[PDB]
Amino acid sequence: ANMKNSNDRIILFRKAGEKVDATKMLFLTEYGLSHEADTDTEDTMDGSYNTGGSVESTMSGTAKMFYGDDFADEIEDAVVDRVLYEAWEVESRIPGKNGDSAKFKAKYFQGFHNKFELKAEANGIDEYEYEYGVNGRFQRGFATLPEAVTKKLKATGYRFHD
């Protein structure tokens, strides 16, 4: 019991340094966040030992493109123009305890988008996939979800709604 569905993660972005509310990444199909340490090991006849190299960290994902949108166009601008982007990963169902009562547990990253591929195939809605390279230590915290996007602008049909 209490298993954690993937679709309860909310991924948010904004262009770094401009004072605007973060924009939600709609229609994610799959997602992943990776951390990996580039450790070497040094041998000696006294015995081998393992040396603590640096860590590379990256976020990756796929989404379906749609007509009421302009964000994939921003991703493909960002990868070419090397624009710095802030990003959040927010857990839509872990609320903050007190004072942060209206906020949800999150990771904050900033970094650069490093990949964007459109995939289009006959008899199919075209996907795009992207990769984002995190700078430094990601920072833990609590994040405010943009309530107007997440709960006010509900829509009927197969779009998820309460």
Binding site: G17, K19, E86, V90, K103, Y108, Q139, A143, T144
Partner: peptide, 12 residues
Amino acid sequence: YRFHDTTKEDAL
């Protein structure tokens, strides 16, 4: 960098 909230009131 430190943590910054999603909203424009906490712009970078």
